[model samples]
Target chain A: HVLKFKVDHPFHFFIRHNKSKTILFFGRFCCPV
Target chain B: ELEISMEQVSASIGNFTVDLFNKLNETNRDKNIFFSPWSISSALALTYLAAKGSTAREMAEVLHFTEAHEQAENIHSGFKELLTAFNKPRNNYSLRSANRIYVEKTYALLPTYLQLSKKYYKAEPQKVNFKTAPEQSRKEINTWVEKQTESKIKNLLSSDDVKATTRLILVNAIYFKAEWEVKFQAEKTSIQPFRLSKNKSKPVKMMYMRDTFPVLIMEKMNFKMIELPYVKRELSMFILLPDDIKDGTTGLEQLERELTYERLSEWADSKMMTETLVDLHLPKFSLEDRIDLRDTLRNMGMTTAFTTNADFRGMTDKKDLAISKVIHQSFVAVDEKGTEAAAATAVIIS
Candidate 1:
């Protein structure tokens, strides 16, 4: 049995500063091409 | 000047990020989107330093600066602290933000504005001959941006972007390069079908990794969140993917529509996410995005800043100044090893 997490679709993602929790970058990956 | 906490400023930035994301999503449906919230905001903050009256008020509201600080100087102080934190020396990652103010050689900027900009943002105004050599000025600015971003971002401004009328341009560039804490093996990466919709799918190079990661499952919202930390855990990329729908496209409409700053903070809370052993498959891809933010900022209640009614007398005695354009360009590459991202924003005032 496997616990899988797949990002095979459109998704929202953000890179954050760990300490301050500042959003350095934010984007949506809809067209992987 | 009131002492503002980093948390307050972070919240303001986060709120603005979410708001801008929603606005961008509305116009760019089904497209890949990428931008640096910090880069854009910091560049605008420089402009806000020179803005007065209605222009300042509108920018403050749009940027949520008013929420972070009552005094305008305090807001710059908060940014000073934030930028200093981000630019600090780190062993695991290379992250830095650079700002510059380019003014047409004929125009004179207020001395106080120059001093404050240099003091708070470390941005020194450089005189460029925009009136006679707009293309040359563009190249010079682009070269500086490219250098700051490790050459990741090139030719940020086109010839048409700068003109004789361009008086001042506030530019901010940030570069970040880091390896994943637990990197995926390149051998395990393979082509897989990425579901674009209920019936449409495309091939993508999906990298595989099996490890313990901070995971959060939103049962009510029907989405899953995961944190992929960079080396030293100083920074992390949080991804939110919606559950697949039976008949519709990627079930992201609901999550996108309902996302807000407070809700996102709660969803990404450390307590809510748990370390779980998981199999992860992520795409290995690169994205470069360019956006003209003049219209977007206008729509976000920053109308006067781009109009004849704008007031930026704080910059100079010249009353004819107004924002002509706000341009942003960003690049990101994610692979088996980690991520490298860079972004630049330019606010052109004429």
Candidate 2:
């Protein structure tokens, strides 16, 4: 959760599309419950 | 809903409150949220993703994106001028460089039942939706609208999760169910006689009714509507009744000058019926608006992605990011099936 609004590349498509690695180097797109 | 420009909704509500205060300051988020919600449901899901598809250069690189080689020089001036605000309450507000007239009032503005949690990336938050495929259904309806507007929109809107995120999983579910032709029976909503202001009258907790609530007759003024229920659909408590309860005050600049809609259909054409037994009330408060709206959006003329010198290369290839947070969540529910609300927000781009 460091980025805020303009998301085109979104962490290179969250790592070339959803390898998600806990989401672009985990911090908070959620996933930990 | 694509017809934009209100200064691109004041720069999409200042890049969605600085990208939802950078996802509500995660605090290394050791999980367990009760209600640390985001700002105005992230400006209503960022004005429904700036009408389902946006670009201020992909919102300006969720906060650290590059490639802004000054694309044809700062294009985007659709025309508007609505500023002149002042607040000094909590988190105080007041930033006016200038503003005068931007009152365009179009009406079809509400369509985002969480696009089934945004296709399939299934709105992260400690993940676990699994029902994948078919474009992962817009990231599982953007992870069930970011866990039902910040964790629990009546148990994540179950209609088997809207028949498995329908529409070829194209996601973006927007819903709004309304009703209340006049009904609030529970022994005429207890503890009555409310009318507080300028001649005051008290004893509120009112919800009693013998029925018929939806009166808006106005040549000069008239209005009434009240409903409160929130547990599943997420939010509800409209209450707008004010015909001439004078000596009982109702201000908001006469609610922005005699509320129009052709003066409430010519005051719904004078009816004059009987059997009235009203005393319905308001205020059973419960709301968590959360904020970080990035300095209320760099005070609003968008100081250029918080200034990397400036210029969005139409969304990516860089400018070194500057948003970093904004997360909103709103939900509403009214009893016996009437107002089923919905909300979802996220703007994590760094």
Best by DockQ: 1
DockQ of each: 0.81, 0.01
Score candidate 1 by lDDT: 0.89
Which one wins on lDDT? Answer: 1
Candidate 1 residue B31 Cα shift, in angstroms, is: 0.8
Tens digits of per-residue lDDT, candidate 1, B59-110, equal 9989998741133676788888888899898666889999999999999989
Candidate 2, residues B45-102, lDDT tens digits: the string is: 2222322112344333332221332211111211111111111122211111111110
Q: Could you say which candidate leads in TM-score? A: 1
Taking all chains together, the TM-score of candidate 2 against the true structure is: 0.26
For every candidate, the chain B TM-score is 0.96, 0.27
